[PDB]
From Swiss-Prot:
Main localization of the protein described in the UniProt heading: secreted
Protein name (database record): Serine protease 1
Entry cofactors: Ca(2+)
EC number(s) recorded for this UniProt protein: 3.4.21.4
PANTHER family the record matches: RIKEN CDNA 2210010C04 GENE, TRYPSIN-RELATED
Family: Belongs to the peptidase S1 family.
Binding site for substrate: D171, S172, Q174, G175, S177
PROSITE patterns per record: TRYPSIN_DOM, TRYPSIN_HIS, TRYPSIN_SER
First-tier enzyme category under EC: hydrolase
Domain Peptidase S1: 1-221
PTM entry text: Subsequent cleavage after Lys-125 leads to alpha-trypsin. Further cleavage after Lys-170 yields pseudotrypsin. A cleavage may also occur after Arg-99. Not sulfated on tyrosine residue(s).
Length: 223
């Protein structure tokens, strides 16, 4: 997260870190046995880490559970990042509490102008590199599709939405991918891509989760 603030330990209970020997992506816990993340974060040997704040220090609220199965969206296109969403099933259910909790899926799409909370352990600089050890947060509004498509001509599909600031300075970034974008207590987006981080007129592009609620529910129910 660039230009954000330190969330605080366990203040974002649905935030998970995907670890394959190191943190490589974020994700959101939707129920005790399922995690949603970005399809571009796919890889084998994923261990899900919940209840994390400092990902390099065992502070006592963590739950490390390996994935039993990963399901990348049927129509995921790695070249365009269209349908950048993936589901991960845990080998065993997580113990839910005030520090480790699931996030509700939306029943309707959120409108432009809605303020959301984006979080992750990604790079904190628009130029250069600096990865934090504790969870970073950012409040940003959903941008209109018009400004979103003007910012990224020929690249924004109906399954994407922009959130952030056209002025730049604040945005999600490398390492934040797969993370949550929560608005009104509902998971509305997944950190997907953007041109660099926090650049002027290059806001973050997020997977529009409301378009995938049926696929998520049906997959969970049969797996
Ligand atoms: Ca820790």
């Amino acid at each position: 997260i660039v230009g954000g603030y330190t969330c605080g330990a366990n203040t974002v209970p649905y935030q998970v870190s995907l670890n394959s020997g190191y943190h490589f992506c974020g994700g959101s816990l939707i129920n005790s046995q399922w995690v949603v993340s970005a399809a571009h974060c796919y890889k084998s040997g994923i261990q899900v880490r919940l209840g994390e704040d400092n990902i390099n220090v065992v502070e006592g609220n963590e739950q490390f559970i390996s994935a039993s199965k990963s399901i990348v969206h049927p129509s995921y296109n790695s070249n365009t990042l269209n349908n950048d969403i993936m589901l991960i099933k845990l080998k065993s259910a997580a113990s839910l509490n005030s520090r480790v909790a699931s996030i509700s899926l939306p029943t309707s799409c959120a409108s432009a102008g809605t303020q959301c909370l984006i979080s992750g352990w990604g790079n904190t600089k628009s130029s250069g590199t600096s990865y934090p050890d504790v969870l970073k947060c950012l409040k940003a509004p959903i941008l209109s599709d018009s400004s979103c498509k003007s910012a990224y001509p020929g690249q924004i599909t109906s399954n994407m939405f922009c959130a952030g600031y056209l002025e730049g300075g604040k945005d999600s970034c490398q390492g934040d991918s797969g993370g949550p974008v929560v608005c009104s207590g509902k998971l509305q987006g997944i950190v997907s891509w953007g041109s660099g981080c926090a650049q002027k007129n290059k806001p973050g592009v997020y997977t529009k989760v409301c378009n995938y609620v049926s696929w998520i529910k049906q997959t969970i129910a049969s797996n």
